[PDB]
Enzyme design. Structure first.
Site, PDB file in Angstrom:
ATOM      1  CG  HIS A   1      47.326  30.817  41.542  1.00  0.00           C
ATOM      2  ND1 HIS A   1      48.248  30.651  40.516  1.00  0.00           N
ATOM      3  CD2 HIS A   1      46.036  30.164  41.031  1.00  0.00           C
ATOM      4  CE1 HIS A   1      47.462  30.531  39.476  1.00  0.00           C
ATOM      5  NE2 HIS A   1      46.890  31.065  39.389  1.00  0.00           N
TER       6      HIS A   1
ATOM      7  CD  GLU B   1      40.259  28.929  37.789  1.00  0.00           C
ATOM      8  OE1 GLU B   1      38.944  28.800  38.079  1.00  0.00           O
ATOM      9  OE2 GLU B   1      40.883  29.795  37.648  1.00  0.00           O
TER      10      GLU B   1
END
Length: 207
Positions: free
Chosen positions: A9, A82
């Protein structure tokens, strides 16, 4: 036969503030959006059949910018999130060093020694991320797709592809935001064609 583009990201506010995110989230910065825009241009000629992203806002936002109105479905998968960092999420490195110095040192220096009471270990992340990658490959035979995920996730995936033991998880190269990694999946094997390429990025930051 599947071609996988993997990326991280774009830069967020917590990345700049050195605050660990994990399952918590923060908005992309102007730079983060600019980098995602640059990545979208780089992939404008690549025929993407789909884009897979973790459910985190920062990942989805990056995926939307990269897509930039193109007719490509975006699918979200929790297995791409994550590493869950429990107590450390939202806190800066200094704050964490004050809380759990030993565990923090292990996280960065001896990954195999990291064993939190609350949170995932590196092996937990590697297993779920690989399962997601496998399911993506199984649904896209003969196609090319993009996966937008996170830093630790990318590191555990590369370790798997390169057949590297987890104690060496943090070996170069650094996976910068919107960096490009290409994995060619042929004959049941994952081949690393490109890793952490940042050609499209103006100013590269170790964030």
């Amino acid at each position: 036969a599947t071609t996988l583009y993997l990326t991280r990201h774009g830069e967020t506010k917590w990345n700049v503030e050195r605050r660990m995110q994990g399952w918590q989230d923060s908005p992309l910065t102007e730079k983060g959006r600019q980098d995602a825009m640059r990545l979208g241009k780089r992939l404008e000629a690549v025929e993407l059949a789909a884009i897979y992203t973790s459910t985190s806002g920062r990942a989805l936002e990056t995926a939307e910018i990269v897509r930039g109105g193109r007719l490509i479905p975006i699918y979200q998968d929790e297995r791409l999130r994550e590493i869950h960092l429990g107590d450390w999420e939202g806190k800066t490195h200094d704050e964490i060093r004050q809380m759990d110095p030993i565990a923090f040192d292990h996280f960065w220096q001896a990954p195999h020694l990291y064993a939190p009471q609350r949170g995932e270990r590196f092996c937990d992340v590697q297993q779920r991320a690989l399962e997601a990658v496998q399911s993506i490959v199984d649904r896209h035979e003969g196609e090319t797709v993009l996966i937008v995920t996170h830093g630790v996730v990318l590191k555990t995936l590369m370790a798997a592809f390169k057949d590297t033991p987890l104690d060496h998880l943090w070996s170069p190269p650094y996976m910068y935001g919107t960096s490009v990694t290409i994995i060619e999946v042929d004959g049941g094997t994952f081949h690393v064609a490109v890793e952490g390429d940042v050609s499209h990025i103006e100013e590269v930051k170790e964030v």
